[PDB]
Amino acid sequence: QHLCGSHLVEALYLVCGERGFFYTGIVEQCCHSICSLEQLENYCN
Amino acid sequence: HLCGSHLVEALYLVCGERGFFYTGIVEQCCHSICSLEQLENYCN
Amino acid sequence: QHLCGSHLVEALYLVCGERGFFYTPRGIVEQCCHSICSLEQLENYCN
Amino acid sequence: QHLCGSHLVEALYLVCGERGFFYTPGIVEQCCHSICSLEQLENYCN
Amino acid sequence: QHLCGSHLVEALYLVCGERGFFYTPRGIVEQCCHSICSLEQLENYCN
Amino acid sequence: HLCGSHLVEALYLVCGERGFFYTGIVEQCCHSICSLEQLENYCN
């Protein structure tokens, strides 16, 4: 449940579907800490 | 296009401890676009 | 060679090819993640 | 060599480093349906 | 049974563990993609 | 953070026919951000 780097990016692609996304705090909450699926969708477009 | 090793890594990811079965998910998620909702339907 | 988490999942995929496989949690976690199992046990998780 | 879906996404991440990137639903035209090169791919990065 | 392209490489990654491995396309490509090879044939491309 | 199977997938992609060796590439590309250039030094 730690999402960073290439793996964070794989996760975004997955949960964002058609919505798309931007990638460069999502890192604090989901890479440094464990976020949920719901927390993750909130970074799509 | 969610294909190969990445599809399986995705299943692990959305299913956690619940687990999953892997075989048509290839048709549904690799050859066509499936959603998280559709992917969740391969967990146990 | 303790296959746990994503690595366990990456492994089954390889040895089962088209056969597919099942992943759930005396238990594959016990046999392959907490301990080292061989392919024999892993093929035993295909269908 | 034909980069689509999750792999296209793996590629963008790779060539963009710190710059980051944007991914939408054309890069699909250029790099997924046909084989594209480096810079053609980078302009969908930042 | 037939390992080609990235899969051969994922397989190498898997079976070589700490040894690491070298991938160079008479060839792991001939031996494991065009024909079915075993682990030792596969292991001899680890380091 | 470029790590594990993905690190190995990255090598395969950028090295093409040259091939590559995998073992530090980890320090430079997983724990830290490497560029294509630092990565290519692991091709043949």
| C-alpha–C-alpha distance, residues B29 and B44, integer Å | 18
The structural domains of chain D, ordered by start, are 1-46 (1.10.100.10)
Which residues numbered 2-41 in F keep a CB inside 8 Å of some CB on D?
2, 6, 9-10, 13-14, 33, 35-36
C-alpha to C-alpha distances, C10 to B12, B28, B41, C21, D8, nearest whole angstrom = 9, 20, 20, 11, 20
Are the beta carbons of E6 and E20 closer than 8 angstroms?
no
- CA E44 – CA C14 distance, rounded (Å): 18
8 Å CB contact between F20 and F43: yes
Which of C14, C18, C39 is the best mutation test for E, with the most CBs of E within 10 A?
C14
C6-16 vs E6-16: helix crossing angle, rounded to 10: 120
B-C contacts (CB, under 8 Å): 34
Q: Which residue has the tokens 């690799």?
A: B30
Determination approach: X-ray
Q: Say whether E14 and C17 touch across the interface (CB within 8 A).
A: no
CB–CB of C11 and E11 under 8 A? no
Nearest CA in chain D to B7: D6
CB contact under 8 A, A13 and D22: no
| Nearest chain B residue to C21, by CA | B22
- Beta-carbon contacts of A45 under 8 Å, excluding residues fewer than 6 positions away, are A16, A19, A20, A21, A22
Nearest chain F residue (CA) to B4: F9
**Region label for E10, one of left (φ > 0), alpha (ψ between -120 and 50) or beta (otherwise):** alpha
Residues of B in contact with F8 (CB under 8 A): none
Most B-contacting residue of A10, A14, A39, A42 (CB-CB within 10 A), to test interface: A14
**Nearest alpha carbon to residue A15 among D4, C25, D9:** D9
Q: Give this entry's resolution in angstroms.
A: 2.8
Instruction: Tell me whether residues C14 and E1 touch, CB distance under 8 A.
Output: no
Residues in chain B: 44
Return all residues near F41 (Cβ < 8 A) that are at least 6 apart: none
Output the six-digit token pair for C23.
């992943």
Tokens representing D11?
A: 């590629």
Owner of token pair 């079915």 = E36
Q: Token pair of A13, please?
A: 């692609």
